[PDB]
Amino acid sequence: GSKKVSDRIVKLSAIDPDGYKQDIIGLSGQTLLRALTHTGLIDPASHRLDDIEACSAECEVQIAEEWLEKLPPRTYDEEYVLKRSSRSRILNKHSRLGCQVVLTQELQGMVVAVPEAKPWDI
Amino acid sequence: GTLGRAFYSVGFWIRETGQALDRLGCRLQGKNYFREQLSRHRTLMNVFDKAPIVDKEAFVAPSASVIGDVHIGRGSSIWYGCVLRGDVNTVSVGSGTNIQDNSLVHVAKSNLSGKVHPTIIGDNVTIGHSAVLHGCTVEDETFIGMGATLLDGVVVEKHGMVAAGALVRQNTRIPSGEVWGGNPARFLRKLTDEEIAFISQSATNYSNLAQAHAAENAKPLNVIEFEKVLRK
Amino acid sequence: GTLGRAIYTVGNWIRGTGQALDRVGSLLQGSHRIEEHLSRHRTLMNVFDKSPLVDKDVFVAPSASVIGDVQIGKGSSIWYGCVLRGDVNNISVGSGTNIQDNTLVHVAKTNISGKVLPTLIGDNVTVGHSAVIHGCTVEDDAFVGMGATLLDGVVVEKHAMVAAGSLVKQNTRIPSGEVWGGNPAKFMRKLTDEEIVYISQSAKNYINLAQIHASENSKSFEQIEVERALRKKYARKDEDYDSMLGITRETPPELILPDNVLP
Amino acid sequence: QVTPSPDRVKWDYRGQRQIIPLGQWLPKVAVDAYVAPNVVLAGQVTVWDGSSVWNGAVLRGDLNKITVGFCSNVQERCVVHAAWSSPTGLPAQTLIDRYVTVGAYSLLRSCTIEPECIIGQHSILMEGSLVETRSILEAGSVLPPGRRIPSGELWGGNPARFIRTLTNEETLEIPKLAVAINHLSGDYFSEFLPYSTIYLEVEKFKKSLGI
Amino acid sequence: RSFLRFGYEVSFEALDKGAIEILGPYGISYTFRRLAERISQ
Amino acid sequence: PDIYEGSPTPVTAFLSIAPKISIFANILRVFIYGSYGATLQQIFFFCSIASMILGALAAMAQTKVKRLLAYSSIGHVGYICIGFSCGTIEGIQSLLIGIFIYALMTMDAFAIVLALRQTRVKYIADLGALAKTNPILAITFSITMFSYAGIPPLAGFCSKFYLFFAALGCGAYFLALVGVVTSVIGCFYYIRLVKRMFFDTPRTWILYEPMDRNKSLLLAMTSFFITLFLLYPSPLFSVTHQMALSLYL
Amino acid sequence: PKVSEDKNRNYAVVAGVVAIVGSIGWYLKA
Amino acid sequence: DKSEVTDRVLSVVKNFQKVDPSKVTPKANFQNDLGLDSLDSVEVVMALEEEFGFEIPDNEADKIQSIDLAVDFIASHPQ
Numbered sequence A: 001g002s003k004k005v006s007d008r009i010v011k012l013s014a015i016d017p018d019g020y021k022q023d024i025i026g027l028s029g030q031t032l033l034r035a036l037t038h039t040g041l042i043d044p045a046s047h048r049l050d051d052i053e054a055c056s057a058e059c060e061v062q063i064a065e066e067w068l069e070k071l072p073p074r075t076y077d078e079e080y081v082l083k084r085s086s087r088s089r090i091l092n093k094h095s096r097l098g099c100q101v102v103l104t105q106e107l108q109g110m111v112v113a114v115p116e117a118k119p120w121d122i
Numbered sequence B: 001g002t003l004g005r006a007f008y009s010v011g012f013w014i015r016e017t018g019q020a021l022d023r024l025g026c027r028l029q030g031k032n033y034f035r036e037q038l039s040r041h042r043t044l045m046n047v048f049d050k051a052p053i054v055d056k057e058a059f060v061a062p063s064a065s066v067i068g069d070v071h072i073g074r075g076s077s078i079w080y081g082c083v084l085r086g087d088v089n090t091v092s093v094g095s096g097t098n099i100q101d102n103s104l105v106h107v108a109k110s111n112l113s114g115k116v117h118p119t120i121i122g123d124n125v126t127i128g129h130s131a132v133l134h135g136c137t138v139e140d141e142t143f144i145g146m147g148a149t150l151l152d153g154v155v156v157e158k159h160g161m162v163a164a165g166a167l168v169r170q171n172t173r174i175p176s177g178e179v180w181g182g183n184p185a186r187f188l189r190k191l192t193d194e195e196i197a198f199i200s201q202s203a204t205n206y207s208n209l210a211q212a213h214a215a216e217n218a219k220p221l222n223v224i225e226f227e228k229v230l231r232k
Numbered sequence C: 001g002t003l004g005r006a007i008y009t010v011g012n013w014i015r016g017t018g019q020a021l022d023r024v025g026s027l028l029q030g031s032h033r034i035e036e037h038l039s040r041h042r043t044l045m046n047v048f049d050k051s052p053l054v055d056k057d058v059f060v061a062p063s064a065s066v067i068g069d070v071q072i073g074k075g076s077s078i079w080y081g082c083v084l085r086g087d088v089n090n091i092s093v094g095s096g097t098n099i100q101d102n103t104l105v106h107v108a109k110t111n112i113s114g115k116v117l118p119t120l121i122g123d124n125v126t127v128g129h130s131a132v133i134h135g136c137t138v139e140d141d142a143f144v145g146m147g148a149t150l151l152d153g154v155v156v157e158k159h160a161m162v163a164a165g166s167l168v169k170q171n172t173r174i175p176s177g178e179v180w181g182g183n184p185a186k187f188m189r190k191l192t193d194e195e196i197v198y199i200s201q202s203a204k205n206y207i208n209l210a211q212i213h214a215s216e217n218s219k220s221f222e223q224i225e226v227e228r229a230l231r232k233k234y235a236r237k238d239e240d241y242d243s244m245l246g247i248t249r250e251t252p253p254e255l256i257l258p259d260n261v262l263p
Numbered sequence D: 001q002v003t004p005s006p007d008r009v010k011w012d013y014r015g016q017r018q019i020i021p022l023g024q025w026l027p028k029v030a031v032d033a034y035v036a037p038n039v040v041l042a043g044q045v046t047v048w049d050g051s052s053v054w055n056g057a058v059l060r061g062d063l064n065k066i067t068v069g070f071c072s073n074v075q076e077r078c079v080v081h082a083a084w085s086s087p088t089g090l091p092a093q094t095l096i097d098r099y100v101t102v103g104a105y106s107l108l109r110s111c112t113i114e115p116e117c118i119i120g121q122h123s124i125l126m127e128g129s130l131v132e133t134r135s136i137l138e139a140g141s142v143l144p145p146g147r148r149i150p151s152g153e154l155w156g157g158n159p160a161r162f163i164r165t166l167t168n169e170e171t172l173e174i175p176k177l178a179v180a181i182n183h184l185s186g187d188y189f190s191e192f193l194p195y196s197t198i199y200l201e202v203e204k205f206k207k208s209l210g211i
Numbered sequence E: 001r002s003f004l005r006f007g008y009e010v011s012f013e014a015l016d017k018g019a020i021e022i023l024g025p026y027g028i029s030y031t032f033r034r035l036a037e038r039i040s041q
Numbered sequence F: 001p002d003i004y005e006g007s008p009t010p011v012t013a014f015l016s017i018a019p020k021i022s023i024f025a026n027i028l029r030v031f032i033y034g035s036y037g038a039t040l041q042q043i044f045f046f047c048s049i050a051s052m053i054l055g056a057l058a059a060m061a062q063t064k065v066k067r068l069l070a071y072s073s074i075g076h077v078g079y080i081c082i083g084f085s086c087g088t089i090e091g092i093q094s095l096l097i098g099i100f101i102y103a104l105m106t107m108d109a110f111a112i113v114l115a116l117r118q119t120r121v122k123y124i125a126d127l128g129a130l131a132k133t134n135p136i137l138a139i140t141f142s143i144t145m146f147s148y149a150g151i152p153p154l155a156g157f158c159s160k161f162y163l164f165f166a167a168l169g170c171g172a173y174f175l176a177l178v179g180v181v182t183s184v185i186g187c188f189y190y191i192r193l194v195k196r197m198f199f200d201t202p203r204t205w206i207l208y209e210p211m212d213r214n215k216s217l218l219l220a221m222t223s224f225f226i227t228l229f230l231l232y233p234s235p236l237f238s239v240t241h242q243m244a245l246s247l248y249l
Numbered sequence G: 001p002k003v004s005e006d007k008n009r010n011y012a013v014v015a016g017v018v019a020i021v022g023s024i025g026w027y028l029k030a
Numbered sequence H: 001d002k003s004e005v006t007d008r009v010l011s012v013v014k015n016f017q018k019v020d021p022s023k024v025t026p027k028a029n030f031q032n033d034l035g036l037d038s039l040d041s042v043e044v045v046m047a048l049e050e051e052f053g054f055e056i057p058d059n060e061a062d063k064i065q066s067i068d069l070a071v072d073f074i075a076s077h078p079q
């Protein structure tokens, strides 16, 4: 009725490569990368756009097994980005683009493992 | 018309060329006082061919920003912070009225929303504080409450006192001697006679007080503060 | 020397030519432009004979127009665009308050109802953005929502937040610990200790925030230019050449805000 | 206890200093964006190209950064502020996207506005409040902190109250309205040239006495 | 009836739309989504 | 392409224009003694064909900006080598005209890129919706892309024109067909950029700060040279014929 | 207020004016 | 996943000379159900961090009093 902002609030458990748990807060309907952007653990200047063509695995996040069966899978190029812009030309089967993952209301308590930030300047 | 704007643009060109020559001459002499951040505000800002006309007996506050085709009547006061803007159409301000602190008047700039309606203000209209009259005509001898939000097309006729915090909807006339308030403007009661006299009494007292300010606000610049600012 | 004298003469000639050409360009416009002239707006003016007695610790923004007998306590501040018009009756602003941006404070002419009193504001009181206070008698440590429209005769008690955008009607008293808002009185809810802590911390935050605005707004021309040049010089850093040269560049103290205002 | 001091100036000769830098923070106003002389830019406000800020606006972001998007206008007498934090838990910086009309006396504070979001007069957007795109907010609207407006839909009233749903014909008039306001702002922009000639008057008035 | 049937199921099926449209969209566009891909490596 | 990516953008602006001119001058001076005709022309013929094919089919898939510019430069080097493979006066003239046109157009494109470097433009999608924020820079960059495409009413079509004419002068009809196919393919992914910044409007917009007077003036001069070249191309043709004729006598 | 009183800018200014004179002469004398 | 690591974290618990495989469940409190000492609890935590690379930081090592919480924390870890 009153349309509070708190209804579409999604809380996750992003963990830095230093093994520290973080309680991040996002919105339902926007990308997971946007949710990771407010905390600042992912540099906003690197991935300013939300387009798939403008992705080079700089939004790559590692997902636990228990969260991978309740969101749509990699269609054609979500895997291509992983298997192209990586040190090892192989998929992890536990990683997903944070740019393509949209946050749903039921996707609360999700744990995401942000890896070490790769260079993105030029 | 179009030809006048061409000469206005050429005037800008020549004025800026002369200004740049002045800056080069000043800078060649070893002076950089043209780089100050002086507030470039004019209390009677205009456009190409509007040039707001104000009566000499009226009082306008230095913080007031009269812009456009605003016409000011005899004895009316234009207080501090009001943002009277009259670019698109005329904004007639009546004789003996007053526009209080932190008020404003639109002309509904964008022409998309139908036709733009010029703003008309009657005589002895005690416009209230923080009035946001959005291009509505207001007849003489009336009171407008503080925080009112009059919108375009509203005809507030004679003695139509408007309560504080009103949000009278567009194209909704206020009946004579009837108060409208709330969200939105709804009938509350009928105007009484003591308030009828009080409206004109307040108008007269505010006009006299404005005359007093204009007498004291036109004092010379008091160069003591000028020396104080420079010496730091 | 003589070359300097010749260059100064050439500068005078060029200045005169530029001013003449500016005059010609102004004439070609048809004199349809209002000249800029000088800033006639003055803070702390005398209305009839009474001056506003403002304390030394008070921050009054240059855009503000504090006129009439205004008594402002230590530690408080007046922000931009605000108008403390006190022509008729005194406006005793307490110590530690903050009359925020574009706020208006006015006092009735002792005859709005026959028993008019001058406006008074207590201590540690926040008013908010674009509020309208017309004859109120705010007491110490009270919260006023932004855009509030307190009319005459109202008294707000301590810790008695008025909701933003309210229209508190005539002679309406707000009890301590109550939050009143909307066009009518329209009580909402009681106070919470989280909210009292928030009120106190915001009140002290604006006091320890106002001094940087006070200092920046009161810098001389020979000083503001120096700060502008320094800010331009240190706009961006370069660790590469800094390390290669064996040097380190530290920001000047005058370009660093005090740690109390940082999050 | 209150005491006068001679350091007070009863006539600030220089003026208002429209651009107020706070330490390293500087108001980043872009070219071709109209900012009236009465406007006060303080803190870390950023005005983008094609925008316009009208006289009386007191844009200051001394607490958190405030941004104005492309071709988006902030009308006259609009006070915009930012806070350290918001009740919703989101970053408290207020951001105004493209083609957003703010409307006079809109007291924004730590809000968030999506593009094409016409805001009516007397708007009291509070901390953490969000406005989704293609929506219109009627004049006089007030909404408490943590209250959102959904996608294209018309609201108003003293609280955040639904009114009706926008039609397709009327929901495309927002960008045209913002463009028209930008055109009028540009019309004002050409009125005054850079580097005002007040300094000449400074010298003329200073020559009257001393140096 | 035969003319109307074969104006949709002959001319619009095996002559222009569907048959020689293997040269427009989805006929050669996907052809260059494989040939051009396996040339950077 | 990796060198073009990693190197700083001002460096790769200089790394793809100046060195090629000097190396091609060296090759021209060597050709006056490499009169074998069976060791130099066919190798450059094959390398030109391979370069055009690989550039056209490799810049199609590129999503970055500088990688696309590098592959476009490789394709233009192939087209350039077409004119040298003829080994006649008209072949060398087409060679020099193409080199001049390509140098001017590369200066144009890298002026654009350094202009957009202010906000760290990386991918082709960042410059989306540029027709509204900065319409004039949008149309300038579109003209540059069309000049790359060899679209007739611009410079960059005259070079490819006279290159193909020289190629038909020697009777190498296989070169002409490959040139046509590669020109069409390259034109497609050139206009793909125009699509990304005039037609498609993404939800998120990126705003680019204005540039300095140096880049702006160079950009204006190059853009007026490119569009208005086919109205008065005589001086370039005459100077290139004099240069080619001076190579031997 | 009779001399610029800057022993560094004046040489630059005289260099600029002699450069302008040289340019106008080079246009004219050639 | 949790099931894969549960089969291995149950095995290490059998080496404490106090824990009987007949009184262990996926929902089995160390202090209450198993009757383990607080020091025994921290030894169990110590055995858990030697199973793999993660160190089980101090702040989160005091919210695994129950075995299911420990299993969930281990499964939902990047390392």
Ligand SMILES: CCCCC/C=C/C/C=C/C/C=C/C/C=C/CCCC(=O)O[C@H](COC(=O)CCCCCCCCCCCCCCCCC)COP(=O)(O)O[C@H]1[C@H](O)[C@H](O)[C@@H](O)[C@H](O)[C@H]1O
Residues within 6 Å of the ligand: B024, B027, B028, C010, C013, C014, C017, C020, C021, G009, G012, G013, G015, G016, G017, G020
């Ligand atoms: C009805 C009227 C019709 C209309 C009448 C029309 C008249 C036409 C007249 C045109 C005048 C032509 C002027 C040519 C203008 C050149 C550009 C101005 C150059 C200039 O910044 O000034 C001097 C420099 O000096 C020279 O380093 C080199 C500058 C040397 C060039 C100066 C030559 C000026 C002699 C002009 C002839 C004198 C004839 C006098 C005419 C009047 C006789 C009565 C001041 O340096 P500065 O360090 O303090 O400051 C500069 C300056 O602020 C900016 O360039 C930068 O921001 C800063 O980094 C710094 O470079």
Ligand SMILES: CCCCCCCCCCCCCCCCCCCC(=O)O[C@H](COC(=O)CCCCCCCCCCCCCC)COP(=O)(O)OCCN
Residues within 6 Å of the ligand: F104, F212, F213, F214, F217, F218, F221, F222, F224, F225
């Ligand atoms: C072919 C048909 C189309 C061509 C048409 C040509 C038309 C004729 C040429 C028109 C030229 C108009 C120039 C007007 C005068 C402008 C003078 C401004 C000079 C100036 O401001 O000085 C500096 C700017 O640098 C500069 O302006 C000078 C550097 C400019 C770099 C140009 C390099 C030329 C050599 C290479 C050209 C390419 C050749 C390729 C074959 C400082 O600037 P500032 O004062 O604004 O302050 C710093 C802002 N950053």
Ligand SMILES: CCCCCC(=O)OC[C@H](COP(=O)(O)OC[C@H](N)C(=O)O)OC(=O)CCCCC
Residues within 6 Å of the ligand: B020, B021, B023, B024, B027
């Ligand atoms: C006849 C007028 C000469 C006036 C000379 C002059 O003003 O130079 C300033 C300008 C630009 O220099 P600034 O950015 O420092 O302007 C600083 C600020 N706008 C100022 O005015 O000082 O020079 C040119 O572009 C002209 C290059 C071609 C010059 C022929």
Ligand SMILES: [Fe+3]
Residues within 6 Å of the ligand: A047, A054, A055, A056, A057, A058, A059, A060, A097, A098, A099, A100
């Ligand atoms: Fe991505």
Ligand SMILES: [Zn+2]
Residues within 6 Å of the ligand: B100, B129, C106, C107, C108, C134
């Ligand atoms: Zn009043």
